[PDB]
Design an enzyme around this catalytic site. Structure first.
Site, PDB file in Angstrom:
ATOM      1  N   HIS A  40       0.810  -1.214   0.000  1.00 36.65           N
ATOM      2  CA  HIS A  40       0.000   0.000   0.000  1.00 36.65           C
ATOM      3  C   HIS A  40       0.843   1.264   0.000  1.00 36.65           C
ATOM      4  CE1 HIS A  40       0.141   0.358   4.535  1.00 36.65           C
ATOM      5  NE2 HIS A  40      -0.005   1.638   4.224  1.00 36.65           N
ATOM      6  N   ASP A  84      -0.038  -7.483   2.019  1.00 32.81           N
ATOM      7  CA  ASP A  84       0.460  -6.106   1.969  1.00 32.81           C
ATOM      8  C   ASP A  84       1.989  -6.131   2.074  1.00 32.81           C
ATOM      9  OD1 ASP A  84       0.578  -3.349   1.887  1.00 32.81           O
ATOM     10  OD2 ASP A  84      -0.230  -3.052   3.902  1.00 32.81           O
ATOM     11  N   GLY A 175       2.304   6.964   8.641  1.00 34.11           N
ATOM     12  CA  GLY A 175       3.666   7.334   8.324  1.00 34.11           C
ATOM     13  C   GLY A 175       4.697   6.308   8.741  1.00 34.11           C
ATOM     14  N   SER A 177       3.934   3.082   8.168  1.00 27.31           N
ATOM     15  CA  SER A 177       3.610   1.964   7.298  1.00 27.31           C
ATOM     16  C   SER A 177       4.788   1.588   6.419  1.00 27.31           C
ATOM     17  CB  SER A 177       2.440   2.332   6.397  1.00 27.31           C
ATOM     18  OG  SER A 177       1.265   2.587   7.142  1.00 27.31           O
ATOM     19  N   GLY A 178       4.923   0.281   6.182  1.00 27.50           N
ATOM     20  CA  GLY A 178       6.023  -0.232   5.421  1.00 27.50           C
ATOM     21  C   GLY A 178       7.244  -0.564   6.244  1.00 27.50           C
TER      22      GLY A 178
END
Ligand SMILES: [Ca+2]
Length: 223
Positions: A40, A84, A175, A177-178
């Site tokens: 995402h 994801d 922020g 995420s990942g």
């Protein structure tokens, strides 16, 4: 990161910032030329920033390397956030040292109760907005699958796990995420989603990396 602490410069040497004119997601360096992040977080024109602490000041240990190719998992579903995960190849190999280093992939899945380290440059408030410029850290345990599914009925797949605190107050946030969830020195999770940040009975949900090791290895070997 809500309720965390300041990591300290370059104490999380596998953490990367994905930059498209501004920081928008985290990631993890898994070898000299490849980064893993959340699907995402996909966009065109990514520059990968390694060796960062303060993302607004050049401090001397940074490496800025553009992406040459991005590969979103073949079965990513943007509505449910199942699968994801995304791989990014760097145009050139990073120079690995003590402050810029890769994180190992897991050979086994981690069990509930294991303590992990989550890090990022995301929002630090559960109500309102305040984005830090230096990297923040949170220690948190993996929750049981039963508690996770009770918190998010009908939303948790076998490719996700929950981590954090049912009481709230400490969590990952927008922020982050990942970015990485590291347990016993291995990359076990990717910051994926949640309902708000640090709310009671709504812990963070993370991509379960151990399910994707074979895909990662096969993809890297042929790209
Ligand atoms: Ca910097």
């Amino acid at each position: 990161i809500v309720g965390g602490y300041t990591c300290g410069a370059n104490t999380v040497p596998y953490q990367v910032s994905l930059n498209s004119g501004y920081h928008f997601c985290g990631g993890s360096l898994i070898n000299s030329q490849w980064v893993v992040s959340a699907a995402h977080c996909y966009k065109s024109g990514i520059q990968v920033r390694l060796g960062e602490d303060n993302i607004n000041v050049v401090e001397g240990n940074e490496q800025f390397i553009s992406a040459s190719k991005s590969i979103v998992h073949p079965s990513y579903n943007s509505n449910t956030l199942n699968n994801d995960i995304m791989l990014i190849k760097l145009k050139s190999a990073a120079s690995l040292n003590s402050r810029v280093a890769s994180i190992s992939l897991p050979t086994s899945c981690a069990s509930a109760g294991t303590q992990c380290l989550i890090s990022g440059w995301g929002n630090t408030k559960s109500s309102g907005t305040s984005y830090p410029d230096v990297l923040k850290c949170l220690k948190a345990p993996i929750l049981s699958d039963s508690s996770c599914k009770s918190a998010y009925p009908g939303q948790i797949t076998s490719n996700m796990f929950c981590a954090g605190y049912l009481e709230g107050g400490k969590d990952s946030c927008q922020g982050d995420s990942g970015g990485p969830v590291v347990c016993s020195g291995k990359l076990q999770g990717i910051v994926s989603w949640g309902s708000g940040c640090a709310q009671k009975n709504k812990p963070g949900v993370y991509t379960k990396v151990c399910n994707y090791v074979s895909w990662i290895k096969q993809t890297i070997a042929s790209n």
